[PDB]
Design a protein around this ligand. Structure first.
Ligand SMILES: *C(=S)c1cc(C(=O)S)c[n+]([C@@H]2O[C@H](COP(=O)(O)O)[C@@H](O)[C@H]2O)c1
Ligand SMILES: *C(=S)c1cc(C(=O)S)c[n+]([C@@H]2O[C@H](COP(=O)(O)O)[C@@H](O)[C@H]2O)c1
Ligand SMILES: *C(=S)c1cc(C(=O)S)c[n+]([C@@H]2O[C@H](COP(=O)(O)O)[C@@H](O)[C@H]2O)c1
Ligand SMILES: *C(=S)c1cc(C(=O)S)c[n+]([C@@H]2O[C@H](COP(=O)(O)O)[C@@H](O)[C@H]2O)c1
Ligand code: NI
Ligand code: NI
Ligand code: NI
Ligand code: NI
Lengths: 480, 480, 480, 480
């Protein structure tokens, strides 16, 4: 009896007593996070002694325009001592010390193609103090990847990747990036060059890497720190750095499963990435599996990663399954079977993803596999209604969904079969290529009969999505 | 490089040179069909010398009411020397020899839950001679399982099985069942007791055996001559014989893969079944395979079996896949993979199956598997509009579709995965639980990577639905 | 420059000066119609001296139930001296002369499958005298072919023809059929045995002869007095006479092109038909053409024959074209081309023919030719909503439309091509299989280029539908 | 017994034994294709020895911008030694030899109003080597006739033809057109000035000749080499040539039925056309017919020419019929009949042609003939949704459909009747003015009865659309 996430709660699975249960942070201890009394001091020390650039004192002159670009509510923590709040607070104190005016500081939420964070979401992300400091003056803005008035086209990179970036960050004298060095199937880790290359860029810039051309090759599944997606992240980052004539001050903190800071690294994006990747690999790449697992059992809540309906939207849940594939491919056998509890009730969450019903209909009409949809990316990404919903209705940018399906296809690709149990509308899961069973037990027996045999190595991931999911490797494997 | 049925033509698969190809009737020779000149003599000898039941001349008095119940266009063949035409002509000659009035003979098409054969279809089935002999007088009637003015309820059997049969057959004094002892996933063979128990019955009688409670038991896959399905067929047949006060004259011919008569058997249904079962097993239960087959590759044409759209309608498509499962389970590995070519263009053929769009939508809304739909059988079977379309619009009876899903779930249950290639609308195939690939090669590589390994035993089945399919067994297997 | 019917008016065709113009009743003189002064005297003499049946005075006992079945507004005259009004008035006077009670007389409008005539239409048909004499007491009833409470099933005929007739006519003691001997594509002439067999029967009785099985044989085009259609008419008529125990008093008047009486024939239906055949052939079978006509040019008004939309509804449009084919087949060349003006504006007249939009949609969905629709006849004929609209909303009976398409296919079958000119919505005409051109000149040039050559024999038929059409034959042809 | 294309396969026709069967390349031997070992050498010799201009070495300076404009997947073949792949490879080698940088070379797919080729289609067209060489850097772009950022308006010609052309080709120092001098009803042949005038121009430029005002005159049907369409092609080509100050280097190869190279010619467009014209006339204009054919029998596959649904979309199907008309006018009698097998199942392929459902509805509700639609061309061509689907959803440009109907009208104009055989939804074929018959035999008998007589000259074209269809002439006719 193992409880797995099911929509809003838990559904029980009668898994065998030999099933291995892994919970991030719990089953294998993450690197010890900084104590609460020490988190602020560590962040201040990181800011005051950066890597690859002089501190914010030398970079910022009195009266200089400063853009502090912080990540949205998808990643990071919202506690009183969260990395975003503490880091932005001490960075603002440092800026005020050197004479940088408060009215000349812009807090930019790096949603990128994700939904623009609402006022309450921004308040929760930044904390009451920072929000009430900057929101009344309009000094907290969500990045708009479709507001070309506040976007600068920087041309293409040496590899042909277009670069359109946030105008406030472009014209600012000091661009600071609050980042979380958390485990991410997209490029290995969040923050660093990924933060700038995605959260404050265009869908066209993101289309260079968030496509099957780079995330359906060998280097993406399982993810590493030197995949093509991360390479394009770095390329776009340094391209914008050359275009502005300045480099991003990347205040990035490695976070544990509970989004608590383990270490904080500030300075140059590449220096910060290199310095933080050691602890990021100690926390994210967990050598836990003693044997390859034939069945991976987990549960999908309705609201884990990108908001409500993330575990009920067929495309969003397929992308979550694919993210699990990228995370645990190192411990997955060739014929691995995913058994996921999801309330696939047809709740697409059109408020969050208005384009996803039409993307799903396009997949049903044309696509044998989700990769067949990639040709329509721009078609959604230039859709005026979806663009308007992203810009004003706090919806995800349309092209994000293609990134989603660009990830989601790996779920169909790298698993023998994926079982979705408890689907209230199993037709949507089947339309995403998932086998549908009413309960965990029937899917378990079906997988044993068809793909994995009567004595499979079953891995249970009860908190696969409600927690910061680590990427599992073999016990003898070393963190890449 | 093997062509497989695909819509109205063929799709070519670049299968490995080690792929074994089986064409029913060509790869393994059928029992030698009777010559065209000898067919009439053999049928006349069988009719004049029936088994375990008095000859037709000894059953019908002058002025007797005779019902010749012939099968519909789905099986039997429509050649000049087809069993239906020749057998009915000789039987009518014998009846006129004992002075049976022509006006007292009714030709009943035993569609059962299948669509009432149109006048053109009846003409093609019976030959111009028989048609223009009996059609202008209105003596050829399609059996109506929903015309209760022409239905007689015989009550429950000894096992509580509801029997409602055609009123013309019940009230006649001589009922002559024209039958084809041909390979059939339902009950082993066609004709005999199955002919009466299905073709001239109510949907409630079919619900007794076409329920998953009888189709999904361990004795149905692969189908044999002693399955529960045939048991209910026989029970309903002898219930008819007891309530009617007369015995069916089962003029049955064993047919090869080209619908040519090999031997004609007349007399009581039980005796005809016992005598013709040996040659039926010789023709159908073919001991061909020397090894278990990991991949079974075939193609689905748009038109086959029940009519147009059978290879495109998702539910009929799954029923055809499950029929293949039933027929070839003896040569299948536990992780067997189906790779079928089907256009799957969303052509439900509402004229043939108007209830099937609603059934598919119900499957998507509620059903994890197709068995979840069975509780709605009566709901479709009593649907007024679908009943009207079956009675007058020459549509299939609604409950027949449930029989299909009752069969079709087996395709999901037994195969590890079924690949559909060439799907114009892959969404319907995926909503049936099928993996969708654009071409045969992609599905083959996917099956090799996921289920069967890089060196699978691949069986090619070209014309698997164009010709009368056989039940493939291992070389050392004995015919049931 | 000849004006042809077009919607509510005329369209001019710049036909060659060699075009022959035929106007029924004008180009060839009709038999001299009875002048208004002696019309009453002739009708009274015919009624008092019937043919092969006793006079009405010798048939109706005092206080006996009498049903006067008069035809609807589709055919016959509506003037003061119209056959229906005068004949019914004189018959009622004769009945009152022998003491037959006024209350015991029922005036039945024999619509059959045609729309029940409204109270206004019944008044116009019967005259104010007869209407206000019998309407206020409810003694004028439209025949309801779907009011089984007022229908009597007489069973199949000797030819297997189902007969269900009006209950009032069946249960009456004297049934008097008012009839018009006029040019009719159905059965040669109207009235007589056709009157009873169609105007007061069930749709099942009409289905015996109004299907392609009877309308599309070689003996129907051109139509005569010895076609199979007339044979079924006679068989159903004598079946009605035999089951009733009484003989129809067929008070029939031969009508010219202006619906004026030429001679009145009363008595048995067979004897009346024999007596009136000569003058019916003289009026209808006109030997006018001295050569075969390659192009037949006529115009279709919006209102004619069955009512509004007849020239605009695609199916009634094809039925009118096929009626023209049937009437003018004797003068038609093998490759004859019809060029018809019609406002094919998509006005289906759902009030008149609610089943016809569905019938046309079915034809587009699966009908290569209109005969492909015949299998659905009962499906429309048993449709509850269409039956309700026929019974209460004064709509045509659904199966009547099938009769129309049963006729209408002839237009497709016999003409090389039919050109519709002036169609506001040419798509409906094309979906009926008609070539569409904007003007008469374009269609004429197209027909000359494609089928008939640059010097065709063009026949102009203005008012081909406004006047009672004739069956044109060659000058040397004899009248059947 | 001749098999003609039907949907995804073939259907059989019981044509008379006197029916003449023509297959391009097979029935009449095409000019001998260049051997595979000699194709590359001949292409290199052609590029190194151009006509009308100096070679690419003398035209391209080191660092000069070069646009290699290649045709889409519709024609040209995709074999390993196809003209596009080999020609582009050797041309790139020559450019690298003279010092032209790889980053300064743009591979432009000249889709024109045709759908932008997807990444997979571009890969298949160009070969894996060329694709992976230029695709990752974004150096392969589809021509966008609606991206005015990358379009240059060159004004009108001397005849008022608007000229808007691809901006990359305009600003490039060397424009190299890869061309296929294969049979084409549009202007006689592809490549040369047609390639530039259509594949990299605006819909407004194409509207000068793709309207009925140009392709419905005497010269277009039958197509010749001096038709007005080719004249306007030449005019637009030289207009763009003078506008850029450079002339197109037309590397054009003549192709056989199997798209294999027969002769490769490079240099100026007019000189290339003149040189390749003899081979193009030898391969394309085949003097095969000994007598004019009253019936031409062929069949449409679902996929051919412009993609999926070409044989099922009613407008696309009718345009294919018209292309056959233009191809075989020289061997076609005045009362010619087309009998084409097509699965006219209503599959419009909205993905390929989203505007064609609404264009078809416009034809049904307004158009007597297809020319009546031409006034709405710009209305579709400026439709924002259809433009977006062409630009991003890989759909055909809207105005292309009008070109299609501009061709398609000839099918109605130059044939007495066209019989569409086996239509699943015959209403669409009838709405395109085509006679619909269920089987080949029905259409054959109908055509014999109506248009061509009982002993017609029947031509069979079993591979009319699955191969590069030649234009047939009389055996005494010289190639124009
Ligand atoms: C990672 S792929 C990523 C992608 C996007 C897109 O728009 S696609 C946006 N972001 C934003 O960058 C911040 C932190 O990155 P993380 O990897 O999501 O944790 C955050 O604001 C993201 O929304 C990231
Ligand atoms: C087989 S299970 C079967 C089922 C039905 C139903 O209605 S369910 C009807 N029939 C008819 O019986 C005839 C011959 O049987 P066959 O197995 O189809 O060959 C024939 O008329 C069937 O339609 C059979
Ligand atoms: C002629 S076929 C016919 C058919 C019908 C049908 O219902 S179908 C009905 N009637 C009616 O009989 C009366 C006179 O016949 P006529 O040929 O129409 O003049 C008249 O009331 C008809 O409506 C006739
Ligand atoms: C021929 S008329 C033609 C028309 C167009 C239009 O947009 S209309 C486009 N093209 C493209 O030019 C290339 C080769 O020409 P072909 O005649 O098709 O072989 C090719 O890319 C065409 O798509 C041609
Ligand atoms: Ni992203
Ligand atoms: Ni059955
Ligand atoms: Ni009638
Ligand atoms: Ni073109």
């Amino acid at each position: 009896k193992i409880d797995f996430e099911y929509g809003h709660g838990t559904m029980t699975a009668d898994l065998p007593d030999t099933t291995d249960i892994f919970i991030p942070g719990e089953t294998v201890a993450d690197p010890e996070c900084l104590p609460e009394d020490q988190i602020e001091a560590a962040t201040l020390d990181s800011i005051r002694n950066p890597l690859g650039m002089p501190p914010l004192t030398e970079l910022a002159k009195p009266g200089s325009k400063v853009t502090i670009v912080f990540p949205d509510r998808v990643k990071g923590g919202e506690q009183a001592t969260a990395h975003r709040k503490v880091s932005i607070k001490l960075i603002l104190q440092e800026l005020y010390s050197v004479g940088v005016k408060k009215e000349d500081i812009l807090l930019i939420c790096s949603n990128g193609l994700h939904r623009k964070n609402t006022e309450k979401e921004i308040l929760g992300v930044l904390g009451p103090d920072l929000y009430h400091q900057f929101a009344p003056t309009g000094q907290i803005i969500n990045h708009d990847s479709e507001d070309y008035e506040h976007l600068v086209d920087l041309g293409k990179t040496k590899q042909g990747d277009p670069v359109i970036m946030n105008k406030y960050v472009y014209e600012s004298d000091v661009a600071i990036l609050i980042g979380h060095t958390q485990g991410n199937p997209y490029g290995g880790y969040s923050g660093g060059y990924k933060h700038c290359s995605t959260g404050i860029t265009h869908w066209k810039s993101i289309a260079s890497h968030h496509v099957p051309k780079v995330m359906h090759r060998k280097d993406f599944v399982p993810v590493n720190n030197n995949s093509l997606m991360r390479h394009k992240f770095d390329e776009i980052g340094m391209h914008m750095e050359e275009k502005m004539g300045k480099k991003f001050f990347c205040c990035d903190a490695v976070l544990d499963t509970k989004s608590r800071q383990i270490e904080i690294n500030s300075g140059a994006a590449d220096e910060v990435q290199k310095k933080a990747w050691k602890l990021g690999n100690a926390r994210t790449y967990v050598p836990f599996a003693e044997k390859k697992y034939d069945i991976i059992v987990f549960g999908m809540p309705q609201f884990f990663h990108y908001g409500d309906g993330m575990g009920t939207n067929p495309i969003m849940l397929m992308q979550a399954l694919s993210a699990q594939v990228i995370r645990h491919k190192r411990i997955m056998s060739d014929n691995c079977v995913f058994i996921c509890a999801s309330t696939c009730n047809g709740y697409f969450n059109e408020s969050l993803w208005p384009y996803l019903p039409e993307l799903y209909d396009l997949f049903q009409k044309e696509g044998n596999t989700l990769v067949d949809l990639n040709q329509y990316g721009e078609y959604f990404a230039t859709n005026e209604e979806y663009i308007r919903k992203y810009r004003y209705a706090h919806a995800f940018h349309p092209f994000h969904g293609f990134s989603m399906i660009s990830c989601a296809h790996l779920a169909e690709k790298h698993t023998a079969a994926i079982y979705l149990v408890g689907a209230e509308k199993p037709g949507y899961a089947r339309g995403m290529g998932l086998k549908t069973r009413a309960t965990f037990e029937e899917a378990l027996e079906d997988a044993k009969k068809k793909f994995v045999g009567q004595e499979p190595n079953i891995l249970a991931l009860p908190k696969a999505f409600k927690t910061a999911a680590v990427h599992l490797m073999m016990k003898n494997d070393l963190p890449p």
